Structures are given as C-alpha cells and as structure tokens.
Design a protein around this ligand. Sequence first.
Ligand SMILES: NC(=O)c1ccc[n+]([C@@H]2O[C@H](COP(=O)([O-])OP(=O)(O)OC[C@H]3O[C@@H](n4cnc5c(N)ncnc54)[C@H](O)[C@@H]3O)[C@@H](O)[C@H]2O)c1
Ligand SMILES: NC(=O)c1ccc[n+]([C@@H]2O[C@H](COP(=O)([O-])OP(=O)(O)OC[C@H]3O[C@@H](n4cnc5c(N)ncnc54)[C@H](O)[C@@H]3O)[C@@H](O)[C@H]2O)c1
Ligand SMILES: C[C@H](CCC(=O)O)[C@H]1CC[C@H]2[C@@H]3[C@H](O)C[C@@H]4C[C@H](O)CC[C@]4(C)[C@H]3C[C@H](O)[C@]12C
Ligand SMILES: C[C@H](CCC(=O)O)[C@H]1CC[C@H]2[C@@H]3[C@H](O)C[C@@H]4C[C@H](O)CC[C@]4(C)[C@H]3C[C@H](O)[C@]12C
Ligand SMILES: [Zn+2]
Ligand SMILES: [Zn+2]
Ligand SMILES: [Zn+2]
Ligand SMILES: [Zn+2]
Lengths: 373, 373
Amino acid sequence: STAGKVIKCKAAVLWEQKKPFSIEEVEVAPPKAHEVRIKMVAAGICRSDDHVVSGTLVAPLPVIAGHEAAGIVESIGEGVTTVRPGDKVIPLFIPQCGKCSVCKHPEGNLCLKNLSMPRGTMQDGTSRFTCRGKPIHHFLGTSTFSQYTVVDEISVAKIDAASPLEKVCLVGCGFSTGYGSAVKVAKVTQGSTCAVFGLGGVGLSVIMGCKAAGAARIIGVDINKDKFAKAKEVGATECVNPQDYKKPIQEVLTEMSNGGVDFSFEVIGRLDTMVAALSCCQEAYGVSVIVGVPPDSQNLSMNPMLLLSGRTWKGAIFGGFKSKDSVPKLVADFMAKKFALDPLITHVLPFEKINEGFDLLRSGKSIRTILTF
Amino acid sequence: STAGKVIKCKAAVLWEQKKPFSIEEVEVAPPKAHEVRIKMVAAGICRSDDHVVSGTLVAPLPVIAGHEAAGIVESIGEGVTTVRPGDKVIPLFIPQCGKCSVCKHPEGNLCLKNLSMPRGTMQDGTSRFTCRGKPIHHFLGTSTFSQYTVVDEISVAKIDAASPLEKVCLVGCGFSTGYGSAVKVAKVTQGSTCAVFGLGGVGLSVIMGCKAAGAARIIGVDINKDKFAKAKEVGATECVNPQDYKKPIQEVLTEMSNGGVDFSFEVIGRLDTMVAALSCCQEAYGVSVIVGVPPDSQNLSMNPMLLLSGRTWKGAIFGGFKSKDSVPKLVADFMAKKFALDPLITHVLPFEKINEGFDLLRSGKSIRTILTF
Ligand SMILES: NC(=O)c1ccc[n+]([C@@H]2O[C@H](COP(=O)([O-])OP(=O)(O)OC[C@H]3O[C@@H](n4cnc5c(N)ncnc54)[C@H](O)[C@@H]3O)[C@@H](O)[C@H]2O)c1
Ligand SMILES: NC(=O)c1ccc[n+]([C@@H]2O[C@H](COP(=O)([O-])OP(=O)(O)OC[C@H]3O[C@@H](n4cnc5c(N)ncnc54)[C@H](O)[C@@H]3O)[C@@H](O)[C@H]2O)c1
Ligand SMILES: C[C@H](CCC(=O)O)[C@H]1CC[C@H]2[C@@H]3[C@H](O)C[C@@H]4C[C@H](O)CC[C@]4(C)[C@H]3C[C@H](O)[C@]12C
Ligand SMILES: C[C@H](CCC(=O)O)[C@H]1CC[C@H]2[C@@H]3[C@H](O)C[C@@H]4C[C@H](O)CC[C@]4(C)[C@H]3C[C@H](O)[C@]12C
Ligand SMILES: [Zn+2]
Ligand SMILES: [Zn+2]
Ligand SMILES: [Zn+2]
Ligand SMILES: [Zn+2]
C-alpha cells in the first residue's frame, strides 16, 4: 500500500510570517524507527498556530504547523509498540517519554524530550517533509496541518476506536489545556469564586473545569462582548468587558468578589492581563494561573509585593496533564459523556479552507474551527 | 499600681530616616478596650526594622519600631479575655481576628485587620505614645522597642509561663518566618533539593525547616562567605558565593541540581535575586518562595515563560502561620526541644545599646542580636 513509501499529499506550508498558508503538495517520508505516520482526519485551529504566523511565537520557517488534531495510523516504523496501523490517535504536542525525571515526578508534565519552538524537527534532528524539493520544518513534533504527518512514538497516543475525530481533536489541545488548568493546576475548590480572562476555546474550557470543580461564581472577562453568551452557556455566572469601566479590571474584580477572587486564569496572552489576573486574586490565599502565551521578547513588569502577601502565581502547559497517560483517558471520559465539546465548535471547514479558518479566528468570529481532511 | 495610669518609660524613637534611634522618655497610655499593655523583656533586631531606618520600608515618622519580641502583661483593658497581668506573651505583627475571610480560610494568614506600613497606629487609628509634645506612631501594631508597649488583643499571644523570653522572642518573627516558609508555604518534600538565598536569621530558619522536612540537599547562597559556617551547622549541605562565579547564580544552581532545584527561597530582599531564585527552580515543577522585603515602589521585570513551563511562585508573610494559633504552639515545640534557637543568636546587648545592635547587623557580623530591657 503506502507503507514504506514516500507519500505525496496536500499540506499547509507556512513559508513566511504574516502571509497566508500555502496549500500545496508535499512529500512525506515513511516513518523511521520509533516513528508513526498518521492520516489526519480533523485538526482544530488554536491561537498558538496563529502565533507562528504573527511572530508572537518564533518558529523556524518554512514549517508545517498544526498541533490540535486526530487521525488514523497509516504505518509504523521499527520498534513501535503503543500504536498499530488502523488505530485512531491524537498527536501529543508535549511528549511523554515515561523515563525522564519530569515524567516520573507526580506533578510535572514538561517531558525533557519536548521539542519546543527552536527545534523544528523530529527527535532525531531531521525532517520528514519536503516541498518543491526543499526540506520543511516540523512544529511541536506534530505538524498536523497535512493530510499525512510523521511523529515520534512518545508524541502520539492511541484513543478509542469509536470516537468522533472531528470532535475529540480538541482533546489534543484546547479543551484539555483549559479544563486541566482549572481542575489539575489551580485545583479549583467547591464554592469558590473564579475569574477567567479570555473567552476563546481555551478560556471556555477553563470555565467548564471551574464549573465541574463546583465553583460558585465564574466571572468571564473579554473585550469582545460577543463571546459572553457562550461563556454563560458553559458556566460563567457573569461576564465583564474591561472597556466598559472607568477603573482597571483588577479593581473591578476585587470589588465584585468582596476582596479578591479565589482563582484567576489568564487565557489571552498579554502581559497586562497576566498582571491584572494576579492582582485580582485575594492577596493572602488567591491563586492565579497563566495559560496564555506571552509575546516574544517582552518582559513583564510587576510589583513583588503582590506575591509577598501570600498569592500563588503559576503557569502550565496542556492543563498540567502528562500527555500520553491523559489523552486516552480524556477521550474515554468524553465517550462516557463526562464533558462536552460541541460548545467549543463554531465552524467546520474543509482543510483546503485553512486560511478562511484563521481569518475567522483573527476577526473574533469563531471559537474553534475544525478542519476536515 | 501602674494599672489605669500613664507610664513614663524609655523607648527607642526614630525621628528621621537614616539616623540613629533616640533612647527617649516617652509616655505610654493605659490600654483601652481590648488592648494589652506589656512590659517588654526581650526584643530581636530584624532586618525589617532596619528597613524602616534605611527607607527600604516607608513608615510614618516619628515611630517606635520593633516587632520581634516577648514580654509580660502589665495590665489589660476592658473586655480582654485571652491574657491576664503577669502572663508571658509575644506581640503579633500580623493579627488573628478569627472573623475575617482570611482568618476563616484554611491557608491564608494575612488577617484583614493587619496594620501594615502606612498605618502607624493602633487598631482604633490613634496612638498610645507621646514624646516631646507630640504623638509618636506605632509600627505593625507592636512597637516593641519600648520598655512598655500597648497592643490590640488580636495582636498578642499568651505563651508558656516557663518560657525563656530572651530566646522565644525569635518566634515573634525570624524563626517562625523562615521555618514556616519551608514547612508550611513551600511544603518542602523529603529527598528534595532546596536553594536558600540569604543566610541571615530568616534564611538560617528556612534551612532549619528544609532539614526538618528531610531535604536531601540544601544549598545556601550568600555574598558574605562568613555566613557559611553557621548555615552548614544548621543544615546546609553546601554553600555558594555568587561572587566566585563567572555565570549568574541561577545558572550555577541549575547546573548543580542537574536541571533546577525543587524549592528555592529568596530571603534577602532584592529584585534580581527574586527573579534568580525563580529561575533556578526546575521549569516544570519547581516552587520558589519570596520571603525577603523588596525596596519600596520598585517593580521587577521577568520573562513570563518562566512560569508558563510549570513553575510556581509565591510569597508569604510570617511563614504562612496564622499567628495567634501558631505562636503558642511554636513556643511549646521549643520547650519540647523540637527546634533550636541558640544558633540564631550571635550577640546580646542591653536595650540601651540598640544602636550598637543595628550597627552589628549592618556590619555583616551578626545574625540576631537580642536586646534585654
Ligand atoms: N498553556 C498552553 O498549553 C496553551 C494551550 C493553548 C493555547 N494557549 C494560549 O492560550 C491563549 C488562548 O488561546 P485561544 O485559542 O483560546 O485564543 P483565542 O484567540 O480564541 O481567545 C483569546 C480571547 O482573548 C480575548 N482578548 C484579547 N485581548 C484581550 C484583552 N486585552 N482583554 C480581555 N480579553 C482579551 C479575545 O477577544 C478572545 O476571545 C493564547 O495565547 C494561546 O496561545 C496556551
Ligand atoms: N516575609 C516576612 O514575613 C519577613 C519576616 C522577616 C524578615 N523578612 C525579610 O527577609 C529578609 C532577610 O531578613 P534577615 O533578618 O534574615 O536579614 P539579614 O540582613 O540578616 O540577612 C540577609 C542576608 O542576605 C545576604 N545578601 C545581601 N545581598 C545579597 C546578594 N546579592 N546575594 C546573596 N546574598 C545577599 C546578606 O549577606 C545577608 O546575610 C529581609 O529583606 C527582611 O526584611 C520578611
Ligand atoms: C505549548 C505551547 C504551544 C501549544 C499551545 O500554546 O497551544 C508552547 C509555545 C511556546 C513554548 C514555550 C517557549 O518556547 C519558551 C520555553 C522554552 C523551553 O525550552 C521549554 C518551556 C517553554 C516555556 C516553552 C514551552 C512550550 O513549548 C510552549 C509554551
Ligand atoms: C510583614 C512585613 C514586616 C515584618 C517583617 O518583614 O520582618 C511587612 C513589610 C512590608 C509589608 C507589605 C507592604 O506594606 C506592601 C503590602 C501592603 C498591603 O496593604 C498588605 C500586603 C503588603 C505586601 C504588606 C504586608 C506586610 O505588612 C509587609 C510584608
Ligand atoms: Zn494549542
Ligand atoms: Zn519524559
Ligand atoms: Zn482576621
Ligand atoms: Zn521581622
């Protein structure tokens, strides 16, 4: 079949910052030892993929981006034991080698084999993609905006064969990150007051986790008032737009919560909202979690007295989940109806319309657009 | 005999920043409702009292500083029920009203009735001290650099009648703060690697707590190498002087710990060491606690990606302990030989030689100087 052969297929190649993805033919090499070649079925558009196009994130170009997705194994290289041809899988943008000291720690999830922004390759340092005869870089070891991709085994998890890939691709990034940020990283408590800054796909998933944790109050914060209705549908008890007030938003949230909230989340990616989210939590016992990706080459300025009083400030990737252990469990929980993903899906488009999906996100009109291959 | 009447005694008044304390005759009013007048027996010289003199901390002047101390109750105002004349007590620079949101919270200890720097008075907004035809401000509700002081009842804890006050005054600030920072705020784990920046009285107490928690490695960091022998006596496994290295201290500690420490503590009061302490903790699961007091009105600058990878940054006052509940317990623990205080006392002087005590601290030769009244 195609096993052992170079596959020619369609992919979305980003050749330059601030330009449209180029949908064109690429050559995908067969998998080497401990690698998995996957036929993609659905991919979501995450704001971090847009960060590569705007320069917010600096990744080596040209590149095949995409990290929130699901597909079916087409073939495996020598030594693969955790997946087989025909299995439904989700690529893991943070790997889980299971042997490093972070993988063995009870709370860490940033596996030391992670391939972050500067490392635009597979684990062996090379690429499996060619376009117009030129080598193309990988992204986060996943590169899912392609009809076929090749990933390292520690970067892929087998999931339930009955799951709907057009929905569960969100477990690869958006949903898990927000939900885990509330239930695992902040460990929101029953009856608490939470403030969530940013009501995109990840922020809505933080609201779902605060509601599942039993929070009594969930204040959504966004400058785009069109995001409020969906936020309330999934759990927000109130929504506030910072542009409607004469005072800084942290002052407004502190007054609203009678002294500061128990848990706050920054799910935007701005330095001023990271500082405001910290400030609006209660000065002695509040907890603030940074989920948004800050702008490249910019430092945050803050008064350390905000921490000395007793606040906890922390960040996390992928909701704190150890990726290969958690993604299959999250898909099984979805199959058991333990959470819902339809509230995050506002648009469905064929993969070929990827640029239209990115323009929907940039214009503020969508939450998650799912691309179907 | 002195109950209900003004007491004329000596106190150390600070009339101007960067000047010596003046031992002067002051008038101490009798205690009003729910107030306790205390005969001081011993007071420790903490670097935060020196911060008032240097301008690192801004407090309304003139002022009677002092907040680490122990004494005996001389008289009680109307309604007092938790202490009686003749009881040994430790003034609490952070109160425990028992009724506010923080006091009712399981982890929080900055009671909403705390009198911080701008609030140079008793709880009722007035002063009990007069000197040279003028009212003198209080400091942290305690003002212990006086033969007699008056404190609100939510700011005083009764302790064991057989307690050695010349030693347990350190439970009023340095010891408790450092020890709690490790065992209650950071919750140091057995077998972990800790880094302690600053080896003064509070840093040595942090080392005592990390050793009590079973850390496997405790790295003391100080630019004054004369502080290393005592740090190793109380538990440090190694000491490093940043001046001996070409690289910044956070990189040195990251290498020493093969990727970052589990727990780091800033116990100095500098913006750059607060950022260095956060950077030297492990990027996915490290915890950094800010204990030092930074300079007034100055923000720090940092890369938020230090937190997005998974680090936790927090600060705490008085080791996270709820004060009225914890001070008597810590004194009982001292009487039962659960911890030691002599390692922190390097010098003893009469109260009349307070300026010499501050000169000792500023010269780098002392850890804690205990003043006897
Ligand atoms: N930590 C992680 O593992 C991880 C995973 C996913 C996404 N992310 C990051 O999380 C952030 C959210 O991702 P997303 O896909 O939900 O994005 P999104 O663009 O869909 O949502 C961002 C929301 O922030 C709102 N917003 C923008 N500026 C604002 C301001 N100044 N004040 C208040 N609201 C404002 C926008 O209106 C929008 O609704 C991004 O920075 C993304 O890169 C981090
Ligand atoms: N959070 C609280 O509740 C609390 C309570 C007590 C004290 N404090 C603060 O804790 C800090 C320590 O107090 P202390 O009484 O132990 O003070 P201290 O002056 O005895 O000790 C500070 C130590 O830091 C060292 N130091 C200075 N600059 C340094 C540098 N660049 N690198 C490495 N080491 C350096 C000094 O040599 C010294 O040994 C002070 O800022 C004080 O205000 C906070
Ligand atoms: C996981 C996320 C992209 C996925 C997404 O945001 O949707 C990426 C974007 C920026 C990345 C971070 C930046 O490259 C900065 C850091 C680089 C270090 O080598 C690892 C942690 C580090 C903090 C990275 C962790 C993780 O790879 C990040 C946070
Ligand atoms: C407790 C400590 C003084 C005693 C000690 O340092 O030894 C004092 C010095 C500076 C004070 C801090 C500063 O006044 C800044 C903040 C003021 C807020 O109103 C309470 C928290 C706040 C963060 C204060 C908490 C506490 O009163 C501090 C931290
Ligand atoms: Zn993402
Ligand atoms: Zn690993
Ligand atoms: Zn209280
Ligand atoms: Zn002190």
